[PDB]
Design a protein around this ligand. Structure first.
Ligand SMILES: CCCCCCCCCCCCOS(=O)(=O)O
Ligand SMILES: CCCCCCCCCCCCOS(=O)(=O)O
Lengths: 157, 157
């Protein structure tokens, strides 16, 4: 569904701390519940030398904030990764400047969620504008955004 | 907080069937849960001859879809009503053309939710555009929108 990918992505340069400033999804149920399936809070990106992407995130599960470690494997397209789990869901990097923001989407094989990641716990209106522009023609039906207090809390409490 | 109100509103002309096509709120928790406090689905508006506004709506409460009947009392401002309940929360009519869409907000005394109401169970992109433009500088952190199937179901299941 997503036909915006970043050209010339250097995955080594997305390494490090990120904050999930905003998220949106195609179906309300994907982000609705506190333990909704795609309601995940990115902590850190850890590219491997081989160009795979290790992802640390938090997820509300079974009544508490849980730590998760995800491996997204590289594909022939630099901006597209495949998560090794049941149905191989794709991670697509739409746009980044490495030092401030990164926009990405995840999709199955039809559900879709996207996020605006930022480097610091601040509301970046410019990054949010790029996020909303990118989402403009994607079929989203839920959108969440977080304040600086929430961004410094586990699972954005 | 809301400083957009409709000039020349004729409340008699908003009477009848409406659909809650989209909703947004200042705090995620106001719309997050299925039984969230401001997650309400408008059914019908029934102005009184005296210019008060009877509101029929559905709300998820105690595990099921419940019917509610609300009276919003008129004030000296044609576009502003006061709901007779605990803390007198204000209903503000931002914009309408009567025959297609109506944009309104509800606020306490600081929480805020707004909706885009439409006359028919169809996605009205133009009405949604006006909704988003109106919300642009309001401090919203959650937004939901519904599809035509959902609009024809109780509590938008
Ligand atoms: C540039 C990449 C940005 C991060 C990609 C995030 C992928 C998250 C997938 C979580 C799936 C659900 O997570 S799970 O732990 O519950 O299974
Ligand atoms: C032009 C006016 C548009 C409709 C106004 C809707 C006001 C809804 C307030 C519900 C409060 C919560 O509802 S309650 O039944 O749980 O108490």
């Amino acid at each position: 569904i997503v036909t915006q990918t970043m050209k010339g992505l250097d995955i080594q340069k997305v390494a490090g701390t990120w904050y999930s400033l905003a998220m949106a999804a195609s179906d309300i149920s994907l982000l609705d519940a506190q333990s909704a399936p795609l309601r995940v809070y990115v902590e850190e990106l850890k590219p491997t030398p081989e160009g795979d992407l290790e992802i640390l995130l938090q997820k509300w599960e079974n009544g508490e904030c849980a730590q998760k470690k995800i491996i997204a494997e590289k594909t022939k397209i630099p901006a597209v990764f495949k998560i090794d789990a049941l149905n191989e869901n794709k991670v697509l990097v739409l746009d980044t400047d490495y030092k401030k923001y990164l926009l990405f989407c995840m999709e199955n094989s039809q559900s879709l969620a996207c996020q605006c990641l930022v480097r610091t716990p601040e509301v970046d209106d410019e990054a949010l504008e790029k996020f909303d522009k990118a989402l403009k023609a994607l079929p989203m039906h839920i959108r969440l955004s977080f304040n600086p207090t929430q961004l410094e809390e586990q699972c954005h409490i």
